[PDB]
Amino acid sequence: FMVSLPRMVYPQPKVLTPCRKDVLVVTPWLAPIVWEGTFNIDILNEQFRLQNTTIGLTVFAIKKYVAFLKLFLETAEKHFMVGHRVHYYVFTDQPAAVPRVTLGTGRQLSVLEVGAYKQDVSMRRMEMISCERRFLSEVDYLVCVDVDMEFRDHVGVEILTPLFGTLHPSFYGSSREAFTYERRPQSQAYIPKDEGDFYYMGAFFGGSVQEVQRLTRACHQAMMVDQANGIEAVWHDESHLNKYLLRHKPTKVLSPEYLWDQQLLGWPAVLRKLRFTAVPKNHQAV
Numbered sequence: 001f002m003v004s005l006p007r008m009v010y011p012q013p014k015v016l017t018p019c020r021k022d023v024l025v026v027t028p029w030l031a032p033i034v035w036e037g038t039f040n041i042d043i044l045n046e047q048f049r050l051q052n053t054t055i056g057l058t059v060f061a062i063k064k065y066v067a068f069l070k071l072f073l074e075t076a077e078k079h080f081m082v083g084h085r086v087h088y089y090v091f092t093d094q095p096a097a098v099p100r101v102t103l104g105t106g107r108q109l110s111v112l113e114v115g116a117y118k119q120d121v122s123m124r125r126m127e128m129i130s131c132e133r134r135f136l137s138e139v140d141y142l143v144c145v146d147v148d149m150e151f152r153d154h155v156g157v158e159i160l161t162p163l164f165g166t167l168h169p170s171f172y173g174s175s176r177e178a179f180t181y182e183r184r185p186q187s188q189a190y191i192p193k194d195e196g197d198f199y200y201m202g203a204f205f206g207g208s209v210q211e212v213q214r215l216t217r218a219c220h221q222a223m224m225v226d227q228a229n230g231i232e233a234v235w236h237d238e239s240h241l242n243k244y245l246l247r248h249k250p251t252k253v254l255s256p257e258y259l260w261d262q263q264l265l266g267w268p269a270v271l272r273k274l275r276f277t278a279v280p281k282n283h284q285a286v
């Protein structure tokens with residue numbers, strides 16, 4: 001049950017004036033595409049706070065990637081779901097290397113020890129996430145992100161919905177034939193050249209606990225079939241994520257404001273804010 005919103009004073013939405021004319025703000029299956037200017041955060045804050053919403057954030061920090069945690073967590077404190085209940089789940093092979101980061105009120109962090117794989121690290125996240133009964137008891141939504149990242153601007157309850165994906169910053173302008181989907185029919189992740197809505201980033205997806213568990217279970221199962229079939233998808237977990245979200249349409253899609261790389265891609269006109277961004281790294285070294 002959901003109580004009434006309080007009286008609120010804000011600018012009237014204008015039916016004959018779009019918020020944004022430069023971008024698509026709704027998908028053909030009527031899911032919002034979340035861009036700056038499309039949402040009144042005060043209204044959304046009210047709605048989610050009235051439900052006493054708790055947001056779980058999962059992050060894997062395996063082997064050298066423990067180095068990324070301090071910046072990741074400190075910036076999350078400044079920008080991620082501020083004012084709402086947050087539970088961070090940090091999956092790591094080195095619990096002692098987790099930095100002591102000061103948390104605001106209503107926010108907690110749990111350290112979950114896991115093994116370290118020698119592609120496998122990235123891929124096993126789906127399995128590791130799918131944990132099941134615990135998330136259901138502790139949080140309302142789960143957000144699953146990469147750790148080699150920092151928050152630079154607001155990432156809030158505007159993202160929350162049963163199931164979301166994020167537009168990959170390199171491909172939001174690309175035609176579907178150019179998308180780097182798995183193209184081999186022998187893989188569970190296979191998507192033909194005439195199919196595909198968007199290319200979603202593996203580094204930021206989420207939803208209700210129920211929908212995230214479904215997604216992660218399905219992707220884990222598909223990866224297992226592939227392994228038994230001697231095939232590994234071209235972009236690993238991301239390829240499977242893309243297949244899942246093709247066949248199970250997300251109820252919101254996050255714009256590339258939510259997963260950006262400024263070093264690689266700059267700051268184009270279509271982006272009013274850079275919210276959650278790649279931290280430069282030496283890939284093979286790290």
Ligand SMILES: O=c1ccn([C@@H]2O[C@H](COP(=O)(O)OP(=O)(O)O)[C@@H](O)[C@H]2O)c(=O)[nH]1
Pocket residue numbers: 059060061062063064065121122145146147148203283286
């Ligand atoms: O040695 C590793 C490699 C990967 N990861 C995790 O898997 C995610 C995805 O890998 P990475 O960020 O290297 O992929 P990219 O964004 O460069 O495609 C990382 O953010 C970490 O959360 C990790 O913890 N340790």
Ligand SMILES: [Mn+2]
Pocket residue numbers: 146147148203
């Ligand atoms: Mn990454």
